[PDB]
Amino acid sequence: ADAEEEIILEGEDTQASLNWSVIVPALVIVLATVVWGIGFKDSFTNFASSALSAVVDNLGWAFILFGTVFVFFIVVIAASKFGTIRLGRIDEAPEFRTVSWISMMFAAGMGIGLMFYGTTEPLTFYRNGVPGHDEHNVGVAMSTTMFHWTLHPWAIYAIVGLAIAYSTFRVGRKQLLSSAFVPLIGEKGAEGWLGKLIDILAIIATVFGTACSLGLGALQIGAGLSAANEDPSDWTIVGIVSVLTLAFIFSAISKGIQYLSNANMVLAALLAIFVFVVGPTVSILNLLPGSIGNYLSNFFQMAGRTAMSADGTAGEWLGSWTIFYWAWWISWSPFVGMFLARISRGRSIREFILGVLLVPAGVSTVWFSIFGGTAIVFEQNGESIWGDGAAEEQLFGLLHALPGGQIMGIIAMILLGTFFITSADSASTVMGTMSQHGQLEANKWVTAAWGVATAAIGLTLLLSLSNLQNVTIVAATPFLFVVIGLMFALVKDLSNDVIYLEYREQQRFNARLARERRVHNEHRKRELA
Amino acid sequence: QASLNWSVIVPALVIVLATVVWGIGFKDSFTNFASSALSAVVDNLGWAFILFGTVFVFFIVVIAASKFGTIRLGRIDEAPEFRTVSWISMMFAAGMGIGLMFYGTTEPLTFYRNGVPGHDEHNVGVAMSTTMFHWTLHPWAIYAIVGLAIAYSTFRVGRKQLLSSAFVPLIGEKGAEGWLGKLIDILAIIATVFGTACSLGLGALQIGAGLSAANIIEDPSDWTIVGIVSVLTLAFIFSAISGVGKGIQYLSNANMVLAALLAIFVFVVGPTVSILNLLPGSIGNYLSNFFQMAGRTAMSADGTAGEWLGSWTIFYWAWWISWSPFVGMFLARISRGRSIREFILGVLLVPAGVSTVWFSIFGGTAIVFEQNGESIWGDGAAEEQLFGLLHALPGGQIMGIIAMILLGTFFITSADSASTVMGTMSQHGQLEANKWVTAAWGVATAAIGLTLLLSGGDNALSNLQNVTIVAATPFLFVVIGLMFALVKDLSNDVIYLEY
Amino acid sequence: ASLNWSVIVPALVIVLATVVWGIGFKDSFTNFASSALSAVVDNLGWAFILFGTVFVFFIVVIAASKFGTIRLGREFRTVSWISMMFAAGMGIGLMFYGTTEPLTFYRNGVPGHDEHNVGVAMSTTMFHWTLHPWAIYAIVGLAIAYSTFRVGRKQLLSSAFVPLIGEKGAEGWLGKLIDILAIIATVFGTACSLGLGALQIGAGLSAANIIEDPSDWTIVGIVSVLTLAFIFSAISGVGKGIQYLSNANMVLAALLAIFVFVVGPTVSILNLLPGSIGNYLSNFFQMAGRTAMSADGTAGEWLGSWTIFYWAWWISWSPFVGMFLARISRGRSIREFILGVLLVPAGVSTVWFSIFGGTAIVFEQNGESIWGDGAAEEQLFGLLHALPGGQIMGIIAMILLGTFFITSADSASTVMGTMSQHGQLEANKWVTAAWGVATAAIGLTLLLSGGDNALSNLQNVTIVAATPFLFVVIGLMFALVKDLSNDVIYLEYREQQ
Ligand SMILES: OC[C@H]1O[C@H](O[C@H]2[C@H](O)[C@@H](O)[C@H](OCCCCCC3CCCCC3)O[C@@H]2CO)[C@H](O)[C@@H](O)[C@@H]1O
Ligand SMILES: [Cl-]
Ligand SMILES: [Cl-]
Ligand SMILES: [Cl-]
Ligand SMILES: [Cl-]
Ligand code: NA
């Protein structure tokens, strides 16, 4: 027994048997997407469309409904009795230091978005207005954006994060996105076909998710070069893709990820601390209460905005906006949960939440307040930043209108890169981890096999943005349910938790004990007469 | 014969008969008292129905979150007689009914076509968010109070299953049997009379305007809107005089089918995707606009919405206060041994779920019809709009015949479940009501339905509403004061003292 | 017996100057008011806005959570206690802006909203007079009352900062500075409040057919009269003076409102209770989020003379109010004290505005306006005269107006003397009458500095006076936390599992 016991400890830990049926079926869709997008660029882009108008139009309500559920659900679980439960066992304290913890996850699950949409999204919602609302409305412009980037999207991570972190550290299963479904699917099913199907959908959803954030990032680095210092031909779209395609493959191997994302303060924060002072410092402050206040005010209105909203005239806006962000963050969750779990060893199910929602929310707030704020201010001063309307161009158009803009258009260029890099190395490691049966430390070649093959989709979704968008949206549609159902696994798992049962056992006990106590003191007081 | 309090049955009868006589005999000097009182009630007591309507929702929710939420309806540490899933399935049954049939298509659409006060017209959200506001939290918060009350007094303590006993903490022991004890249980009865009879009329009128639309009867003549009732009035008796057990589940299961069937029909045939969109739209909006709706009044809209109210909000509120005695019993019965916290959340969410999807489907499909050039409005006659909706969909010719029947079945399960509850408050809290009393009440109640329905004449629903409003008005304070009894009663509970 | 000179003298140099400067250099004086006003507003407005809400959430978090159970002790009847404090914290408020505010927000609308909009005219008026302000009273009083009754330090506002500044700190230059700002803030606030009051009472005589002239020889009478009248009460201390007045003050309060409630648009006023509350909850966050950047930039000026002024004003009032709230709240639990400064004062503000603002709107609606020439200090009486028997009740309103101020003045004065003697609870009458008159004569300064410069200086000078004190009120928000966590009843509970 002793010889077969410890032999399996070093067995699964060393296990590098790359699942041939988890990797290949993914390599298939990936390279098939590349070729069906290189060789076929006429019917492929039609797939993106017809599919989108099917996903968005027939499942949009599901993103809309459950998107707001995932928020509440996890807000409950957090303030729930399951809160005190420690991810792993009570023999484990926080793995990394808190500040390094919250910083490693917020800088890992954060698409280049804040760069890309930070300046645009608010300035757009302000110029063109959003459905069911007037125009040039600061409140709605801010509240809406906030709504896209704070609690709503980040509770998605929390769910998958807690679902894996528990299924792994607390129970002891392998770090598969499918093992988190054991409470429902069973020990057998997670090793059956579904287990893979999920670990597949997870990988494919991860790919399109990263490739999108890659394409957008590329377009903006390129547009960042076009306006700052120019490449009409796709030499740099494929060249700057390489610069990054190789950059994050570095950390996937190496800690390098523990340090790369760590420096996003000298870069990102600097940019913000810069724009804060230089620009409309006061106006920005005015948008802090204006963002939180208005965000809280209009919250449910947004969760209710569907296709019938605005007298049925919003189906489009959603697809271009909200519904895209939902599906897009979803495609990221499979691997952002994987990562979030790891650094959350020993984190209570509660503290894990607040560090996943509140911190990233507070930043997303103070970020869109600066750039999206300053932008809307210039738009007001008649000193527009809009330009041609190309989001990729706007970011810098704003920076440049500020004393010391060129120097920051370079910083924000690299920052745009690193923002992707630090959140693409974690992707790869996970791409392979699932490629090798929850192999915590995947062979550095298999992860690099994905990270690069994932950028082979970026060069496709960008050379053949409504493709980087649509394809991503479609690639996440099924995995949506992988989060919706996951929201059930996490419950029928906790509810089967030892320490919780030991609590719910000593709970029933007392109602009986107390009952006896009061019933025999109702006789003492009744027999008294 | 028996000892069933005459002092509660005679004062109840006289007022029902007086209304049937003063409704039939003086069918012109009755409509006056109707609009005359309705004007006093809505003007002078509108702020009340409004202010307290929302109060009840706070009160109830505070009582679940409160440390009282752990207490369970019955002896200490008692447990449910049914499984939490069978429990739910019974409230689901309580959800669907005539009100949903009648106002399921009309109400939303109306708030679209016309828009509500303080808001623009053709507003999909607001049209739903308002509907929700009428049929979800607010209405059930009321029932949940009365229910919670009757369930505590009966199971936790051991008082008779009566509303008077619910007031013991305040009125005193001698009070439940005294004048108030009878008064309260009288108002409760007449409340249930016009409360149900209201539901009955809608059916009889809808069924009627459904025959003239199904091309069976020439027009909903004042002779047509009679044959409808009387036969369903005979249908009632048969289910009561041979054991009322057929109404609670033998018809419930029939309704659970026809209804679920019908809803699914429009759901799949009609704009399935739109209907779905109106799930987060209904809920999402209904949360955004909750308090703005809780603060709407005659002053609202620059002082120009006190009428919109008396025809909707104030009416419904009065229709809920009135039905609260009946629903309180039903709930109280199928909820013994359930914790208060678990009780409320079930009585608020399960039903809310039913209404949400239901309106989301019907109204939803109506609103989408409006949006896309194809209106079902017709003559604005809410009675016929359900069918109009139906006939606009393929096979909507047979579904219009089915709805005709589910109305009958409902007309029973409503006049049937009510007859028992009505008979119960007549016999000192007797659980199993007499086979003659219930059967008698149901018919009496229906007699009022016919009365209000015929007394108004052309679009008589006014009376139905007005009178219902006038019947509930006193019992609105009953419920309000019922909040106070519940609190002291609970603060005196042995477990909150044990803790 | 040994009044802290370093907290008094340095606190007098500032008020003994705002006079000579406001009287000697009349021009450059207001050129500072109008200047500072803009600096504070344009640059700190965001704060009053932001943290203003922090005060509501934080205080509600505390009261309902753990610490709420803590007692404020190791004295006064309860129903007298509420009036004691309500009267002490509430001044000219309901009387000066009780008719004009809803009526103004209605006619003109409010930044980012249509006009003739009842719901918002209430939501906005209610926003200013219910929770947000009274949370500013709960905090200061709390930090003090606790630092004193639960810990043992003196009632000096400074000592409530002990948990952060140190037992040595509240004795250092800050603890004094804190009790220095505490004094001055308390003074301007009552001066501004006195200016408005007397000013309104003056106009109360104009259309009263008693004194047509807004003559100084008249307002001065009313001013000094108020002074001497409340000096009687301040010196008469709690039991005999203050406690007796605050009840009488409430008595008139009802009598008036009751009158206006029956005589005026009864049902409409009732209709407004739900409408006032509902809308208030709905538009709450939107209002907490309304900033100078709201309404596309246009919201700047409005906030300047409405919201921000209010917050800033209530802050110049937190020192004495909150500090007095504490003294009369020994034994009162943390939950009983926080729900004692909010619920009832917020629930009394509500009924008030629904009866007055409601009638004022209800009038606007029937064409029978009561706006006149748009002079706040007149509309109250315009409202009354329109109601049968309003002539006599008009006089009651004038008196009650004096009362409202009086009950707030005495508490101020006494509390001031407490800050003048290292926390002497019941200081020498002569000192509580010294500040009572000292602060009083300041009222004349801002009133006799110019016509519009009354409103100009009373408003602005007050704002500045409570500009730094704002941080003081946000600092207590920390010192109070630590002072709480490290409490016996709490230390004995943290031991779980
Ligand atoms: O539904 C109609 C009801 O009113 C009728 O009388 C009404 C009718 O308008 C009308 O029948 C009556 O005057 C009509 C004169 C010719 C009818 C014969 C009358 C002779 C005197 C007694 C009443 C009937 O005046 C009454 C005014 O209310 C009759 O009483 C009945 O038909 C019924 O009660
Ligand atoms: Cl705004
Ligand atoms: Cl119990
Ligand atoms: Cl809408
Ligand atoms: Cl309104
Ligand atoms: Na006062």
Q: Which two tokens stand for residue A50?
A: 């017809």
- Give resolution, Å, one decimal: 3.1
* All residues at 6 or more sequence positions from A510 whose CB lies less than 8 Å from its CB, including other chains: none
The Cα A173–Cα B448 span in angstroms is 67
Q: Which two tokens stand for residue C7?
A: 């907290």
Contact: B124, A312; criterion CB under 8 Å: yes
Within 8 A of A285 by CB-CB distance, chain C residues are 46-47, 50
Total tally of structural domains belonging to chain B: 1
The Cα C328–Cα C75 span in angstroms is 7
The Cα A274–Cα A404 span in angstroms is 9
The Cα C184–Cα C176 span in angstroms is 12
DSSP per-residue string spanning A57-113:
HHHHHHHHHHHHHHHHHHHHHHHSGGGS-BSS-TT---SS-HHHHHHHHHTTS--TH
The Cα C181–Cα B273 span in angstroms is 63
Q: Which two tokens stand for residue C395?
A: 């006089």
Could you tell me the CA-to-CA distances from C407 to A251, C250, C458 in Å, in that order?
A: 70, 10, 20
Amino acid occupying residue B398: I
Contact: A515, B277; criterion CB under 8 Å: no
To the nearest whole angstrom, how far is the Cα of C311 from the nearest Cα of chain A?
Answer: 15
The Cα A358–Cα A78 span in angstroms is 12
Q: B385: closest CA among B459, B281, B437, B313?
A: B459
* All residues at 6 or more sequence positions from C40 whose CB lies less than 8 Å from its CB, including other chains: C312, C463, C464, C467
Amino acid occupying residue A364: S
Contact: A291, C289; criterion CB under 8 Å: yes
DSSP H helical segments within C342-389, as ranges? 343-355, 357-365, 376-386
Give the CB-side neighbour count of residue B181, counting CA atoms within 13 A: 19
Q: What are phi and psi of A378, to 5 degrees?
A: -65, -45
Q: Residue C293: which of A143, A290, A297 has the nearest Cβ? A: A290
User: Angle, to 10 degrees, between the axis of helix A193-228 and the axis of helix A322-342?
Assistant: 110
Tell me if C315 is assigned to a ligand binding site: yes
C57 touches chain A (CB under 8 A): no
DSSP tag of B96: S
The Cα A10–Cα A8 span in angstroms is 5
Contact: A294, C285; criterion CB under 8 Å: yes
N- to C-terminal Cα separation, chain B: 47
* All residues at 6 or more sequence positions from A498 whose CB lies less than 8 Å from its CB, including other chains: none
A301 touches chain B (CB under 8 A): yes
Amino acid occupying residue B71: I
Ligand nearest to the CA of B299: 5
DSSP-based three-state secondary structure for A390: coil
Could you tell me the CA-to-CA distances from B266 to A523, B240, C69 in Å, in that order?
A: 61, 33, 56
* All residues at 6 or more sequence positions from C330 whose CB lies less than 8 Å from its CB, including other chains: C72, C73, C75, C145, C149
Distance C394 CA to ligand 5 centre (A): 30
A285 touches chain C (CB under 8 A): yes
| Mutation for testing the A interface, residue in B137, B273, B279, B291 having most A CBs under 10 Å | B273
Contact: A293, C283; criterion CB under 8 Å: no
What burial class does residue B481 get, using C-beta atoms within 10 Å of its C-beta: 0-12 exposed, 13-18 middle, 19+ buried?
middle
Q: A168: closest CA among A180, A159, A156, A157?
A: A180
Q: What are phi and psi of C92, to 5 degrees?
A: -60, -20
C216 and C202 Cβ atoms separated by less than 8 Å: no
A396 and A227 Cβ atoms separated by less than 8 Å: yes
B387 and B214 Cβ atoms separated by less than 8 Å: yes
B118 touches chain A (CB under 8 A): no
Q: A129: closest CA among A396, A328, A321?
A: A321
Contact: B285, A304; criterion CB under 8 Å: yes
Amino acid occupying residue C410: D
| Mutation for testing the C interface, residue in A84, A86, A126, A138 having most C CBs under 10 Å | A138
Amino acid occupying residue C446: L
The Cα A523–Cα A95 span in angstroms is 56
Q: What are phi and psi of B72, to 5 degrees?
A: -120, 140
Q: Which two tokens stand for residue C471?
A: 């941080």
Q: C441: closest CA among C220, C235, C186, C234?
A: C220
Could you tell me the CA-to-CA distances from B12 to B8, B19, B182, B189 in Å, in that order?
A: 6, 11, 10, 7
Q: Residue B297: which of C116, C274, C283 has the nearest Cβ? A: C274
DSSP tag of B282: H
Amino acid occupying residue C483: D
The Cα B299–Cα A154 span in angstroms is 42
Ligand nearest to the CA of C278: 5
Q: Strands, DSSP E only, in C288-351? A: none
DSSP-based three-state secondary structure for B339: strand
Tell me if C375 is assigned to a ligand binding site: no
User: Angle, to 10 degrees, between the axis of helix C453-465 and the axis of helix C26-64?
Assistant: 50
What burial class does residue A308 get, using C-beta atoms within 10 Å of its C-beta: 0-12 exposed, 13-18 middle, 19+ buried?
buried
The Cα A253–Cα A260 span in angstroms is 13
Q: How was this structure determined?
A: X-ray
The Cα B419–Cα B440 span in angstroms is 8
Q: Which two tokens stand for residue A48?
A: 């993106």
DSSP-based three-state secondary structure for B27: coil
Q: What angle do CA B34, B37, B42 make, to 5 degrees?
A: 115
DSSP-based three-state secondary structure for B72: strand
Tell me if C88 is assigned to a ligand binding site: yes
DSSP per-residue string spanning B372-433:
TT----TTS-HHHHHHHHHHTSTTTTTHHHHHHHHHHHHHHHHHHHHHHHHHHTTTTT-SS-
The Cα C315–Cα C474 span in angstroms is 11
Give the CB-side neighbour count of residue C209, counting CA atoms within 13 A: 6
| Residues present in chain A in total | 529
CA torsion sign for C357, C362, C365, C369 is negative
Residue with tokens 């109060």: B55
C423 CA to centre of own chain? 22
Within 8 A of C279 by CB-CB distance, chain B residues are 291-292, 295
- Beta bridge mates, C455: none
What burial class does residue C20 get, using C-beta atoms within 10 Å of its C-beta: 0-12 exposed, 13-18 middle, 19+ buried?
exposed
Could you tell me the CA-to-CA distances from C335 to C62, C81, C329 in Å, in that order?
A: 8, 15, 12
DSSP per-residue string spanning B206-237:
HHHHHHTTTTSSSS--TTHHHHHHHHHHHHHH
Other CB atoms within 10 Å distance of the CB of residue B92: 17
Other CB atoms within 10 Å distance of the CB of residue A210: 29
The Cα C36–Cα C59 span in angstroms is 30
Within 8 A of C271 by CB-CB distance, chain B residues are 46-47, 50, 297-299, 306
Q: Which residue of C has its CA nearest to A291?
A: C289
Distance A127 CA to ligand 4 centre (A): 21
DSSP-based three-state secondary structure for A355: coil
The Cα A36–Cα A40 span in angstroms is 5
What is the enclosing helix (H) or strand (E) of C53?
Answer: helix C26-64
B163 and B321 Cβ atoms separated by less than 8 Å: no
Within 8 A of C283 by CB-CB distance, chain A residues are 297
Could you tell me the CA-to-CA distances from A408 to A110, A121, C2 in Å, in that order?
A: 21, 20, 61
Helices (H) and strands (E) in chain A, counts: 25, 0
DSSP tag of C116: S
Q: Which two tokens stand for residue C112?
A: 């980012």
- Beta bridge mates, A348: A86
Amino acid occupying residue B434: N
Q: C227: closest CA among C439, C455, C8, C462?
A: C439
To the nearest whole angstrom, how far is the Cα of B283 from the nearest Cα of chain A?
Answer: 7
C29 and C456 Cβ atoms separated by less than 8 Å: no
Domain coverage including residue A401: 1-529
The Cα C326–Cα C150 span in angstroms is 11
Residue with tokens 């589910």: B406
* All residues at 6 or more sequence positions from B357 whose CB lies less than 8 Å from its CB, including other chains: B263, B279
B302 and B384 Cβ atoms separated by less than 8 Å: no
Ligand nearest to the CA of B341: 3
The Cα B8–Cα B430 span in angstroms is 14
A392 and A181 Cβ atoms separated by less than 8 Å: no
The Cα C240–Cα A419 span in angstroms is 70
Q: What angle do CA C307, C312, C315 make, to 5 degrees?
A: 130
C458 CA to centre of own chain? 14
Q: Residue A294: which of C42, C46, C289 has the nearest Cβ? A: C289
Q: Which two tokens stand for residue C317?
A: 């009032």
Residue with tokens 């400074």: C158
To the nearest whole angstrom, how far is the Cα of B110 from the nearest Cα of chain A?
Answer: 14
Other CB atoms within 10 Å distance of the CB of residue B103: 24
Q: Which two tokens stand for residue A419?
A: 């923002």
The Cα B79–Cα C21 span in angstroms is 78
A72 and A495 Cβ atoms separated by less than 8 Å: no
The Cα C316–Cα C201 span in angstroms is 22
